[PDB]
From a paper:
We also solved structures with the WT LBD for those molecules with no existing structures (LA-Deg, LA-Stab, RU39411) or were able to solve to improved resolution (RAL). LA-3 possesses a 3 R methylpyrrolidine (similar to OP1074) and showed a SERD-like profile with an IC50 of 26.94 ± 0.4 nM and maximum normalized fluorescence of 0.48 ± 0.07 at 5 μM. LA3-2 and LA5-2 are subsequently referred to as LA-Deg and LA-Stab for Laso degrader and stabilizer respectively. We discovered that addition of a 3R-methyl group on Laso’s pyrrolidine induced both ERα SUMOylation and degrading activities, while addition of a 2S-methyl on the pyrrolidine leads to an accumulation of ERα in the breast cancer cells. LA-Deg induces SUMOylation but to a lesser maximum than fulvestrant and GDC0927 in WT and is further reduced in Y537S, while LA-Stab did not induce SUMOylation with either receptor. LA-Deg showed a slightly increase induction compared to ICI and Veh, but it was significantly lower than Laso. Despite their unique influences on WT ERα cellular stability, the methylated Laso derivatives showed identical transcriptional antagonistic efficacies in the WT and mutant cell lines compared to unmodified Laso in our assay. Overall, these structures present canonical ERα LBD homodimers with 2–4 monomers in the asymmetric unit.
The pro-oncogenic cellular activities of [name] alpha (ERα) drive breast cancer pathogenesis. Ligand-dependent transcriptional activities depend on the association of coactivator proteins with ERα to form functional complexes. SERMs and SERDs elicit a structural rearrangement of the ERα LBD to sterically preclude binding of coactivators in the activating function-2 cleft. Activating somatic mutations near ERα helix 12, Y537S and D538G, enable hormone therapy resistance in metastatic ER +breast cancers.
Residue numbers in the entry:
A (entry chain B): 307 to 336, 341 to 416, 419 to 461, 465 to 550
B (entry chain A): 306 to 338, 341 to 414, 421 to 545
The structure:
Amino acid sequence: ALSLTADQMVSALLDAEPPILYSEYDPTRPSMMGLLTNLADRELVHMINWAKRVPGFVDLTLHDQVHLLESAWLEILMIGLVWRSMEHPGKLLFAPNLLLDRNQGKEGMVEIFDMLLATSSRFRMMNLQGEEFVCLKSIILLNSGVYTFTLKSLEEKDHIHRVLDKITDTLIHLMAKAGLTLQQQHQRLAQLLLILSHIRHMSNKGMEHLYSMKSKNVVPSYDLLLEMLDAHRLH
Amino acid sequence: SALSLTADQMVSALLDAEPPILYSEYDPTRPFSSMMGLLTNLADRELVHMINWAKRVPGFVDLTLHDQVHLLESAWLEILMIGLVWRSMEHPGKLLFAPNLLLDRNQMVEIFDMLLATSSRFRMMNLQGEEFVCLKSIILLNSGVYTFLSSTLKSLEEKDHIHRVLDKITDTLIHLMAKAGLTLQQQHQRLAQLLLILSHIRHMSNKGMEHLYSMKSKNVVPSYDLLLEMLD
Ligand SMILES: C[C@H]1CCN(CCOc2ccc([C@@H]3c4ccc(O)cc4CC[C@@H]3c3ccccc3)cc2)C1
Ligand SMILES: C[C@H]1CCN(CCOc2ccc([C@@H]3c4ccc(O)cc4CC[C@@H]3c3ccccc3)cc2)C1
């Protein structure tokens, strides 16, 4: 799977995109963290399906797949949200039936809303494309946990870096395909990758909130993630 | 005007701007135990030199003093950390906080382990000094740029300048790799590998800031006014 062309990498990633879920609230009746949590919990299931279709990810051990998802899942929900929200200045499209502005985020929620809104606006300014977005989301999946991991290990990390390298090649191909000069290409690569630092930052701040709730299962456990990932072949 | 430096001149400027390597102040003839005290004293002295360094990052002092403070308030711990990871590079398994304070993980350990992993990543990539100073400057310019939370005309001008300087550092990084003979493909791949490590350095800073805030001591986190005073 390290033998896909750049164009096939793109097709594969676009094909793998999760569905856009709806919030579950009675639209005929007049809670917020409740809605957001229910949404995130349903997305996680589809996120696992998506991860398994990221070329190269299922070549890893089960344990390493879990570790990467444990590190990246909130960043992945967040970049998804920021992407969806790109065409709604000043609002966050949590779901097509749950479009919130910052005053609807108002304890310690408006702080993270604002960061998400800033990132969406940055995406809008850069005119981020769908093909670029799916590359970036895959990069988060592969990179966020890689510094936190034996001979098999070295083989695992080497493979992860090879896949990351091929996504870089793909991003560059997309930019060359759109007519950017070599200078513009490396400049845009750099701009896009630096935004991943801010997405990390946001995830840390959000994780900080979810832990402060002290509810038994508000961070996906290793064993929960393993259960979702450790699929069987009887379907 | 420093948007008109050559890449070589950018590198020369950054290398010359490098802060000194400070020493820990413990009495070496006395015994050992303390640790957070030593680490804090070191960081507090480094911060002053950090401000001097920042003012020499081409393009930084063209910003308003308010924006200079905002960038440094965002980035200061990331900058201390990338500095640490860099001078620790040739000490596998240890962190060279200062030449007289080289610590292993047994001597927080959550944070030590992340820093040690980054040092090893730098070692694995054979990070060069010229690359290091570009990355450190990128942290300074990038870390706070999405939290300005103001869109006055001046702020728009500020963000544009920050991104033009960041673009120039990118050009400089690519120029360094071209000069070492890397192919175009290798150049782009290495640029990406280096920038993705910045995400981990952000992560570490957040984990570290969580620690310093949990201490509940009056000024462990540098206040806006303190940075303002140092940058005046
Ligand atoms: C992995 C699941 C198992 C237990 N679940 C706990 C609920 O965690 C979350 C995660 C994200 C969110 C909010 C959200 C919901 C859907 C989405 O597509 C993106 C986001 C972005 C973050 C957002 C949030 C996170 C933390 C505090 C406030 C808001 C809220 C609660 C997470
Ligand atoms: C801005 C200064 C004013 C008040 N100071 C509070 C002390 O903050 C720190 C910052 C970093 C450190 C440790 C350190 C010291 C020197 C250095 O060159 C790099 C580092 C990397 C982080 C390290 C640390 C940070 C947080 C918890 C444990 C260890 C310890 C205390 C910070």
